[PDB]
């Protein structure tokens, strides 16, 4: 399980990749 805070709006949400 991996998650990153993206720089694309709206805001910097988290996406769990892998």
């Amino acid at each position, epitope marked *: 399980r991996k*998650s*990153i*805070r*993206i*720089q*694309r*709006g*709206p*805001g*910097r*949400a*988290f996406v769990t990749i892998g």
Partner: antibody
Amino acid sequence: QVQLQQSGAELVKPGASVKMSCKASGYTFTTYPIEWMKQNHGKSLEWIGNFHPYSDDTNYNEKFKGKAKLTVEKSSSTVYLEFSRLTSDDSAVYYCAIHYGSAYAMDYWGQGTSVTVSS
Amino acid sequence: DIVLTQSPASLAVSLGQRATISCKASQSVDYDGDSYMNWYQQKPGQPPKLLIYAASNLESGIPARFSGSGSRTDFTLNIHPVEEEDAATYYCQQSNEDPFTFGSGTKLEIKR
């Protein structure tokens, strides 16, 4: 713990290129994208852009797109802010703040950095 | 882009009186049931502290006296108990659409 120890207190000259460095100790970096805010004198903040170490993606401002090159240094967890052709009207207080806590605004800002122009 | 035309940039508020820093936006900065409007408290020679985020979602760190009432474009910073700690300039940065920008600012000068 985490902290953004940035350094950029230089007396830039009209037509110079100073390369700043915002270090991130106790940081994940790739997960925490960094944004820069330019405060020309005692005025409001101006979001100049952002950066992502994971995908190496940036979002510069339509006015400063290309002038500010954000170099990647995942090895030292530091993002370089190479300001090229700095004009006399570029005296501002930069801040490399990120959205460490909430995913809306930045909570951990830089440790204060200002570039003064000789002329 | 969105213009954050805030209310009277400079004003005086005595200790105890409530302040009203309304940040009006030209465009809708709201999302799916979540507004993206942040407020910072840039103290004299100090980085802008993240007071409120997501329109009215208090930032874990500051007291429960920094309320935020705003929908779409009409936003406001309701600071009922204006203590001495409110001696800083408040800015409203919209993070809904690019490019992200801040507001004119509001140098809140407390009064003894």
